[PDB]
C-alpha cells in the first residue's frame, strides 16, 4: 500500500531492533512501517513479490538475490557516490550483479566454532581430535546437519569449490563437489554420525537448547546465536574452526543485504529508510543490541565493533573462507548439496553416490523463476564446434525416466526458439507465462534422430 | 484456511437430466479450484481442474465453470454412473480444504414404508439387555421420523438410528431404529409401541406389541 | 503403471501415536506432491499434509502440533504420523500423489489415490459380536409379505461380514451401517424381505463374520410364539 513500509527479515536475525530503527521512522516522517518475519521467506518471497501484496524491502544473504535480480523483482539502486564510500567496496562487490547494484550490503556473516568454557578448556585446533574428544566428554559438538551452511566448511575445508571463479567470472561449468577433497571431508562428518558422535537428526533448534544448557561441548554458528547464548549465561568462547587433514576449515562467507521489491511504490521511501536510517550507527546499534550482527558493512561502526573478540573472531574464520557467489545457480546448488548430505547422515546412500547426484544436479540445471503474464528468457550455452551444424530442440521431460515431449524444434503457441550458432547461445523466449509451464525443461542437440542434452532447465512460475 | 461451501447439500435427478453444482469459496482463489466424484467405499476420482480442465478420460458430458469466489460443475445429461458424492477443492490456498460435498441421487417415486417391529429376543433377556428394533423397510424420499412410546411414554436419547444407501434396484431407502434398555427396565413395562411418519403416509402408522403377547 | 498401497497400524488407543506407511511403485518422490488426506465416518475429506517435490513440508495448522510426515526414498515409501491421537481422529485415511512432474502446485490435485487404511482410535477391546435373530410373526407380517432380520450387538472393531443362506439370498436384503453405542462397541441389523409363506418351510440362516476376532456365527431366524 502506498503510504507504508513492510519489512521482511530472517526469524534467526534481530527483527526488535529493526522495530526500533521503525519507530525513530516513524516518528520523523509519519510513516508507519511493519517489519515481519515468516518462516522460509527465502522461498516465500518470490511466490508473493509480483502480486503486490509482498515486502518492500527483504534481508536475505546475497546469494539468492542473484536469481531475484534476473527474474526482475528487484530495483537497481543509485547509492550517491558519497554515500558508497560509508560502505566498504568490498561489501558492495558482494551486491553487484551484471552491474546492477541491487541491494545495500548491511553487515558480514561468518560462522564460527563456539565452545563452551564449562565443558572445554582448550578448543581444538584439527577437526580429527574430536572423536577422541567426545569419547572424554560422553557430547564434543551439536551444530545443524540439516542446512548445508554448516555442514559446508569442513567440505569445502580440503579444497572442494561450488564455481570455478577466473578473472572475476564465474565458470558456471567447472563445478566441484566430487572432487578429491569433499569426498574426504564429507566422510568424516558420516564417521562422526556413525561412530555416535554426532546424530543425523540434529537441526538448529536442538543445538541451540543443547549448547545454551552446558550439554554439548561445542557447536557451529554465526554471530546472530551470541545474543541467546549470553542469556543462558554460559561462559562460551568464539574461536577459529578446527583444521581438516591440517587445512583450515573454509565457511561461506555471508553478506546481509537489504533489496527493494520491484513493485512496491515506496522505493523513494525504502531508500530514505535505508540510507538515512538503517545504516547509521544509531541504527545498527540498536539492531546489533537484539542480535549481532557481525562484521557490519559501515566503516565508522565497524571500526568499534571489529574490536570485539566475537566479531574479530568471525573475521578470521571470514577470511579463511570464500564469499559466496550471488549468481542464480547458486540456488539449485544448495539444494542439490544439502539434499546429498541428509542422505548420508542417515545412511540411506553412500557419501560417493549422495556427491555424485549433488554434482550432477548442480551442474548445467539452471533454475528459472519468471513473472505470470510477463516473457521469461533463457539463454543454454553450448559448444558451437562441438555442436557445429547441428539443429537445435526445446523439449520438456515428463517423467524421471521418462520421454522428452519435444514443444519446438529449430530449423509454437507461447513458446519462440533462436539459435545463435556463432557465440555457442540458444535462446527459447516464452511469451505470457502461465502455471502449468513448469516442467523441468531440455535444450537438446540434434544430430541424425538422436539428441543430446545441452542444458537441463527448471522453471518455475511465480503467481504474479 | 479458506473455507469452501457448496450447495445443494443433495439433490435427486433422473438419468438425461442437466445438473448444476455450486462451490463458493471463502475468498478469491482465481480459477484454481478442483472437482472430484466420489462413490461409496471407493477412493475420490479428479474428474475437473483448474475450474475448467477436465482430466483425462472423464467424459465430456461433465463441465466445469466459475472463478474467483463463485465456482459450478454441470453434467449436461445424467447417466446411472455419475450418482455419487462430488466435492470440489481449491488450490489457491496453503491448506487444501474440501468443501462439504453434493450427494447425487435418482428421482422415484414416492413410497411409504413398510413399518415392521420386533421384540427382544429370549436369548438377549437372559443376557441382562433389551433391544427392541423398529424396521422402515423401502420408502422415499429419505425424510423419515422414528418416535418410539413406551406405555405411552416418549423415548429420547436411548435409540439408534441407521439408514441404508439408495438401492440399486428399486431406487429406495431402509432405516433401522433399535432402542436399547436394561432388562430390568424393560420387565417394568407392558406396552412398546414404533410410531413412524413419513410424506408417503397419509397418517402416522404406528405399530406397537404387549410383552409376552404371542 | 503407477499404483499406492497402504499399510499400517489400524487400530489405536487414546494418547498413543499414529503410524501409516504408503507405498509407491514405479515412479520417485522428485518432481510430484504427495498427501495425506483422512475422511471421518459420515463426513467429508480433510486435507492432513503435503510434501512438495522438493520435500518441503507443509501442514494444516490445526493439526500441525501433531503430524510428522516423512520420506524414505531407499524403499520409496513415505510415512504419515500422529503424535497425540484421539477419538476424533477415528477416519478412513488416504495417500494421494499430485500430477504435475515438476509443475505449478495449483494444478497438483491430487490424482493417483491409494486404497486408504480405517484407522479405529478408542479405550475399548476387541470384542466378538452376539447374533440375536429378529423373528417374523403374524403381528410383524403384513399380507403375503414377511420381514425377517439378524441383529449383530456388542462388536468391535468394525468391519463384520454378513451374508444370509451363505450368499444363495441376495435379493430383497438389507444390512444396515453399523451404529457406534455408548459403551464403545458396534452394532448393526441384517434384515431381510421373504414371502409369508415360505415361512415354517424355508429354513433363513444369517452369517456373521467378524475377521478381527476370527469369530464365525450362524444364527438361523425361525419364528418365534
Ligand atoms: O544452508 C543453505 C543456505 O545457506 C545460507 O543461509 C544461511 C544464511 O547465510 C544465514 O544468514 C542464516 O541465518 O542461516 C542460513 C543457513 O540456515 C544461504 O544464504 C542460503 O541462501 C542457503 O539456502
Given at each position: 500500500?502506498?503510504?507504508?513500509?513492510?519489512?521482511?527479515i530472517?526469524?534467526?536475525?534481530?527483527?526488535?531492533?529493526?522495530?526500533e530503527?521503525?519507530?525513530?521512522?516513524?516518528?520523523?516522517?509519519?510513516?508507519?512501517?511493519?517489519?515481519?518475519?515468516?518462516?522460509?521467506?527465502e522461498?516465500?518471497?518470490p511466490?508473493?513479490?509480483?502480486?503486490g501484496?509482498?515486502?518492500?524491502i527483504?534481508?536475505?544473504?546475497?546469494?539468492?538475490?542473484?536469481?531475484?535480480?534476473?527474474?526482475?523483482?528487484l530495483a537497481?539502486?543509485?547509492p550517491?557516490?558519497?554515500?558508497?564510500?560509508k560502505?566498504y567496496?568490498?561489501?558492495?562487490?558482494?551486491?553487484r550483479?551484471?552491474?546492477?547494484?541491487?541491494?545495500?550490503?548491511?553487515?558480514?556473516?561468518?560462522?564460527?566454532?563456539?565452545?563452551?568454557?564449562?565443558?572445554?578448556?582448550?578448543?581444538?585446533?584439527?577437526?580429527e581430535?574430536?572423536?577422541?574428544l567426545?569419547?572424554?566428554?560422553?557430547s564434543?559438538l551439536?551444530?545443524?546437519?540439516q542446512?548445508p551452511?554448516?555442514?559446508?566448511?569442513?567440505?569445502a575445508?580440503?579444497?572442494?569449490?561450488?564455481?570455478?571463479?577466473?578473472?572475476?567470472?564465474?565458470?558456471?561449468?567447472?563445478?566441484?563437489?566430487?572432487?578429491?577433497?569433499?569426498?574426504?571431508?564429507?566422510?568424516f562428518?558420516?564417521?562422526?554420525?556413525?561412530?555416535?558422535?554426532?546424530?543425523?537428526?540434529?537441526?538448529?533448534?536442538?543445538?541451540?537448547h543443547?549448547?545454551?544448557?552446558?550439554?554439548?561441548?561445542?557447536?557451529i554458528?554465526?554471530?546472530?546465536?551470541?545474543?541467546?547464548?549470553?542469556?543462558?549465561?554460559?561462559?562460551?568462547?568464539?574461536?577459529?574452526?578446527?583444521?581438516?587433514?591440517?587445512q583450515?576449515?573454509?565457511?561461506?562467507?555471508?553478506?546481509?543485504?537489504?533489496?527493494?521489491?520491484?513493485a512496491?511504490?515506496?522505493?523513494?521511501?525504502?531508500?530514505?529508510?535505508?540510507?538515512?536510517?538503517?545504516?547509521?550507527?544509531?541504527?545498527?546499534?540498536?539492531?546489533?543490541?537484539?542480535?549481532?550482527?557481525?562484521?557490519?558493512?559501515?566503516?565508522?561502526?565497524?571500526?568499534?565493533?571489529?574490536?570485539?573478540?566475537?566479531?574479530?573472531?568471525?573475521?578470521?574464520?571470514?577470511?579463511?573462507?570464500?564469499?559466496?557467489?550471488?549468481?542464480?545457480?547458486m540456488?539449485?546448488?544448495?539444494?542439490?548439496?544439502?539434499?546429498?548430505?541428509?542422505?548420508?547422515?542417515?545412511?540411506?546412500?553412500?557419501?560417493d553416490?549422495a556427491?555424485?547426484?549433488?554434482?550432477?544436479?548442480?551442474?548445467?540445471?539452471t533454475?528459472?523463476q519468471?513473472?505470470?503474464?510477463?516473457?521469461?528468457?533463457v539463454?543454454?550455452?553450448?559448444?558451437?564446434?562441438?555442436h557445429?551444424?547441428?539443429?537445435?530442440?526445446?523439449?520438456?521431460?515428463?517423467?524421471?525416466?521418462?520421454?522428452?515431449?519435444?514443444?519446438?524444434?529449430?530449423?509454437?503457441?507461447?513458446?519462440?526458439?533462436?539459435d545463435?550458432?556463432?557465440?555457442?547461445?540458444?535462446?527459447?523466449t516464452?511469451?505470457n507465462?502461465?502455471p502449468?509451464?513448469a516442467?523441468?525443461?531440455?535444450?537438446?542437440?540434434?544430430?541424425?534422430?538422436?539428441?543430446?542434452?545441452?542444458?537441463?532447465?527448471?522453471?518455475?512460475?511465480?503467481?504474479? | 484456511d479458506?473455507?469452501?461451501?457448496?450447495?445443494?447439500?443433495s439433490?435427486?435427478?433422473?438419468?438425461?437430466?442437466?445438473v448444476?453444482?455450486?462451490?463458493?469459496?471463502?475468498?478469491?482463489?482465481?480459477?484454481?479450484?478442483?472437482w472430484?466424484?466420489?462413490?461409496?467405499?471407493?477412493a475420490?476420482?479428479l474428474?475437473?481442474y483448474?475450474?475448467?480442465?477436465?482430466?483425462?478420460?472423464?467424459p465430456?458430458?461433465?463441465?466445469?465453470?466459475?472463478?474467483?469466489?463463485?465456482?459450478?460443475?454441470?453434467i449436461?445429461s445424467?447417466?446411472p454412473?455419475?450418482?455419487?458424492?462430488?466435492?470440489?477443492?481449491?488450490?489457491?490456498?496453503?491448506?487444501?480444504?474440501?468443501?462439504?460435498?453434493?450427494?447425487?441421487?435418482?428421482?422415484?417415486?414416492v413410497?411409504?414404508?413398510?413399518?415392521?417391529?420386533?421384540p427382544?429376543?429370549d436369548?438377549?433377556?437372559?443376557?441382562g439387555?433389551?433391544?427392541?428394533?423398529?424396521?422402515?423397510?423401502?420408502?422415499?424420499?429419505?425424510?423419515?421420523?422414528?418416535?418410539?412410546?413406551?406405555?405411552?411414554?416418549?423415548?429420547?436419547?436411548?435409540?439408534?438410528?441407521?439408514?441404508?444407501?439408495?438401492?440399486?434396484?428399486?431406487?429406495?431407502?431402509?432405516?433401522?431404529?433399535?432402542?436399547?434398555?436394561?432388562?430390568?427396565?424393560?420387565?417394568?413395562?407392558?406396552?412398546?409401541?414404533?410410531?413412524?411418519?413419513?410424506?408417503?403416509?397419509?397418517?402416522?402408522?404406528?405399530?406397537?406389541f404387549?410383552?409376552?403377547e404371542? | 503403471?503407477?499404483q499406492?498401497?497402504?499399510?499400517?497400524?489400524?487400530?489405536?488407543?487414546?494418547?498413543?501415536?499414529?503410524?501409516?506407511?504408503?507405498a509407491?511403485?514405479?515412479?520417485?518422490?522428485?518432481?510430484?506432491?504427495?498427501?495425506?488426506?483422512?475422511?471421518?465416518?459420515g463426513?467429508?475429506?480433510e486435507?492432513?499434509?503435503?510434501?512438495?517435490?522438493?520435500?518441503?513440508?507443509?501442514?494444516?495448522?490445526?493439526?500441525?502440533?501433531?503430524?510428522?510426515?516423512?520420506?524414505?526414498?531407499?524403499?520409496?515409501?513415505?510415512?504419515?504420523?500422529?503424535?497425540?491421537?484421539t477419538?476424533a481422529?477415528?477416519?478412513?485415511?488416504?495417500?494421494?500423489?499430485?500430477?504435475?512432474?515438476?509443475?505449478?502446485p495449483?494444478?497438483?490435485?491430487?490424482?493417483?489415490?491409494?486404497?486408504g487404511?480405517?484407522?479405529?482410535?478408542?479405550?475399548?477391546s476387541?470384542?466378538?459380536?452376539s447374533?440375536?435373530?429378529?423373528?417374523?410373526?403374524?403381528?410383524?407380517?403384513?399380507?403375503?409379505?414377511?420381514?425377517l432380520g439378524?441383529?449383530?450387538?456388542?462388536?468391535?472393531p468394525?468391519?463384520?461380514?454378513?451374508?444370509?443362506?451363505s450368499?444363495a439370498?441376495?435379493?430383497?436384503?438389507?444390512?444396515?451401517?453399523?451404529?457406534?453405542?455408548?459403551?464403545?462397541?458396534?452394532?448393526?441389523?441384517s434384515?431381510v424381505?421373504?414371502?409369508?409363506?415360505?415361512?415354517g418351510?424355508?429354513?433363513?440362516?444369517?452369517?456373521?463374520?467378524?475377521?478381527?476376532?476370527?469369530?464365525?456365527?450362524?444364527?438361523?431366524?425361525?419364528?418365534?410364539?
Amino acid at each position: 500500500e502506498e503510504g507504508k513500509l513492510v519489512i521482511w527479515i530472517n526469524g534467526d536475525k534481530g527483527y526488535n531492533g529493526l522495530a526500533e530503527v521503525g519507530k525513530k521512522f516513524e516518528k520523523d516522517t509519519g510513516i508507519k512501517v511493519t517489519v515481519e518475519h515468516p518462516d522460509k521467506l527465502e522461498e516465500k518471497f518470490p511466490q508473493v513479490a509480483a502480486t503486490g501484496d509482498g515486502p518492500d524491502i527483504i534481508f536475505w544473504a546475497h546469494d539468492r538475490f542473484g536469481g531475484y535480480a534476473q527474474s526482475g523483482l528487484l530495483a537497481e539502486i543509485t547509492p550517491a557516490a558519497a554515500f558508497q564510500d560509508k560502505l566498504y567496496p568490498f561489501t558492495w562487490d558482494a551486491v553487484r550483479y551484471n552491474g546492477k547494484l541491487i541491494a545495500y550490503p548491511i553487515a558480514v556473516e561468518a560462522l564460527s566454532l563456539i565452545y563452551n568454557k564449562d565443558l572445554l578448556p582448550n578448543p581444538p585446533k584439527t577437526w580429527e581430535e574430536i572423536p577422541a574428544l567426545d569419547k572424554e566428554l560422553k557430547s564434543a559438538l551439536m551444530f545443524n546437519l540439516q542446512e548445508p551452511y554448516f555442514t559446508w566448511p569442513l567440505i569445502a575445508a580440503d579444497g572442494g569449490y561450488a564455481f570455478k571463479y577466473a578473472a572475476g567470472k564465474y565458470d558456471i561449468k567447472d563445478v566441484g563437489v566430487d572432487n578429491a577433497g569433499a569426498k574426504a571431508g564429507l566422510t568424516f562428518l558420516v564417521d562422526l554420525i556413525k561412530n555416535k558422535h554426532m546424530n543425523a537428526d540434529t537441526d538448529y533448534s536442538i543445538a541451540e537448547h543443547a549448547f545454551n544448557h552446558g550439554e554439548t561441548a561445542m557447536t557451529i554458528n554465526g554471530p546472530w546465536a551470541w545474543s541467546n547464548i549470553d542469556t543462558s549465561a554460559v561462559n562460551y568462547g568464539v574461536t577459529v574452526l578446527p583444521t581438516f587433514k591440517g587445512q583450515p576449515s573454509k565457511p561461506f562467507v555471508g553478506v546481509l543485504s537489504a533489496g527493494i521489491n520491484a513493485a512496491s511504490p515506496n522505493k523513494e521511501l525504502a531508500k530514505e529508510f535505508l540510507e538515512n536510517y538503517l545504516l547509521t550507527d544509531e541504527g545498527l546499534e540498536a539492531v546489533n543490541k537484539d542480535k549481532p550482527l557481525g562484521a557490519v558493512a559501515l566503516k565508522s561502526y565497524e571500526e568499534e565493533l571489529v574490536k570485539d573478540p566475537r566479531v574479530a573472531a568471525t573475521m578470521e574464520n571470514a577470511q579463511k573462507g570464500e564469499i559466496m557467489p550471488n549468481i542464480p545457480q547458486m540456488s539449485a546448488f544448495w539444494y542439490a548439496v544439502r539434499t546429498a548430505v541428509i542422505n548420508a547422515a542417515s545412511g540411506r546412500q553412500t557419501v560417493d553416490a549422495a556427491l555424485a547426484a549433488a554434482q550432477t544436479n548442480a551442474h548445467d540445471t539452471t533454475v528459472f523463476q519468471g513473472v505470470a503474464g510477463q516473457s521469461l528468457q533463457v539463454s543454454c550455452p553450448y559448444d558451437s564446434m562441438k555442436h557445429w551444424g547441428r539443429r537445435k530442440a526445446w523439449c520438456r521431460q515428463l517423467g524421471e525416466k521418462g520421454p522428452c515431449q519435444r514443444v519446438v524444434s529449430t530449423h509454437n503457441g507461447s513458446t519462440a526458439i533462436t539459435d545463435d550458432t556463432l557465440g555457442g547461445t540458444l535462446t527459447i523466449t516464452l511469451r505470457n507465462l502461465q502455471p502449468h509451464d513448469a516442467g523441468l525443461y531440455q535444450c537438446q542437440s540434434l544430430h541424425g534422430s538422436e539428441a543430446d542434452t545441452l542444458r537441463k532447465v527448471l522453471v518455475e512460475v511465480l503467481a504474479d | 484456511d479458506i473455507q469452501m461451501t457448496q450447495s445443494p447439500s443433495s439433490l435427486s435427478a433422473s438419468v438425461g437430466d442437466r445438473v448444476t453444482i455450486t462451490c463458493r469459496a471463502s475468498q478469491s482463489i482465481s480459477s484454481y479450484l478442483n472437482w472430484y466424484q466420489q462413490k461409496p467405499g471407493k477412493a475420490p476420482k479428479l474428474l475437473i481442474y483448474a475450474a475448467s480442465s477436465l482430466q483425462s478420460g472423464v467424459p465430456s458430458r461433465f463441465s466445469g465453470s466459475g472463478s474467483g469466489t463463485d465456482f459450478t460443475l454441470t453434467i449436461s445429461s445424467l447417466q446411472p454412473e455419475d450418482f455419487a458424492t462430488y466435492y470440489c477443492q481449491q488450490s489457491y490456498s496453503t491448506p487444501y480444504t474440501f468443501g462439504q460435498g453434493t450427494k447425487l441421487e435418482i428421482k422415484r417415486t414416492v413410497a411409504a414404508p413398510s413399518v415392521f417391529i420386533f421384540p427382544p429376543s429370549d436369548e438377549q433377556l437372559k443376557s441382562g439387555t433389551a433391544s427392541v428394533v423398529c424396521l422402515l423397510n423401502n420408502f422415499y424420499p429419505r425424510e423419515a421420523k422414528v418416535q418410539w412410546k413406551v406405555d405411552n411414554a416418549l423415548q429420547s436419547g436411548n435409540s439408534q438410528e441407521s439408514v441404508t444407501e439408495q438401492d440399486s434396484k428399486d431406487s429406495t431407502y431402509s432405516l433401522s431404529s433399535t432402542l436399547t434398555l436394561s432388562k430390568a427396565d424393560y420387565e417394568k413395562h407392558k406396552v412398546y409401541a414404533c410410531e413412524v411418519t413419513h410424506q408417503g403416509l397419509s397418517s402416522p402408522v404406528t405399530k406397537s406389541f404387549n410383552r409376552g403377547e404371542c | 503403471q503407477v499404483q499406492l498401497q497402504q499399510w499400517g497400524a489400524g487400530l489405536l488407543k487414546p494418547s498413543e501415536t499414529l503410524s501409516l506407511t504408503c507405498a509407491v511403485y514405479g515412479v520417485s518422490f522428485s518432481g510430484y506432491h504427495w498427501y495425506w488426506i483422512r475422511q471421518p465416518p459420515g463426513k467429508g475429506l480433510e486435507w492432513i499434509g503435503e510434501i512438495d517435490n522438493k520435500g518441503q513440508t507443509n501442514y494444516n495448522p490445526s493439526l500441525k502440533s501433531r503430524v510428522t510426515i516423512s520420506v524414505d526414498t531407499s524403499k520409496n515409501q513415505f510415512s504419515l504420523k500422529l503424535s497425540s491421537v484421539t477419538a476424533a481422529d477415528t477416519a478412513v485415511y488416504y495417500c494421494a500423489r499430485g500430477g504435475s512432474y515438476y509443475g505449478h502446485p495449483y494444478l497438483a490435485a491430487p490424482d493417483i489415490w491409494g486404497q486408504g487404511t480405517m484407522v479405529t482410535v478408542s479405550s475399548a477391546s476387541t470384542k466378538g459380536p452376539s447374533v440375536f435373530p429378529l423373528a417374523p410373526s403374524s403381528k410383524s407380517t403384513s399380507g403375503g409379505t414377511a420381514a425377517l432380520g439378524c441383529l449383530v450387538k456388542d462388536y468391535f472393531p468394525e468391519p463384520v461380514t454378513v451374508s444370509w443362506n451363505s450368499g444363495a439370498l441376495t435379493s430383497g436384503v438389507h444390512t444396515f451401517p453399523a451404529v457406534l453405542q455408548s459403551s464403545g462397541l458396534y452394532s448393526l441389523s441384517s434384515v431381510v424381505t421373504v414371502p409369508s409363506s415360505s415361512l415354517g418351510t424355508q429354513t433363513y440362516i444369517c452369517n456373521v463374520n467378524h475377521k478381527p476376532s476370527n469369530t464365525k456365527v450362524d444364527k438361523k431366524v425361525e419364528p418365534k410364539s
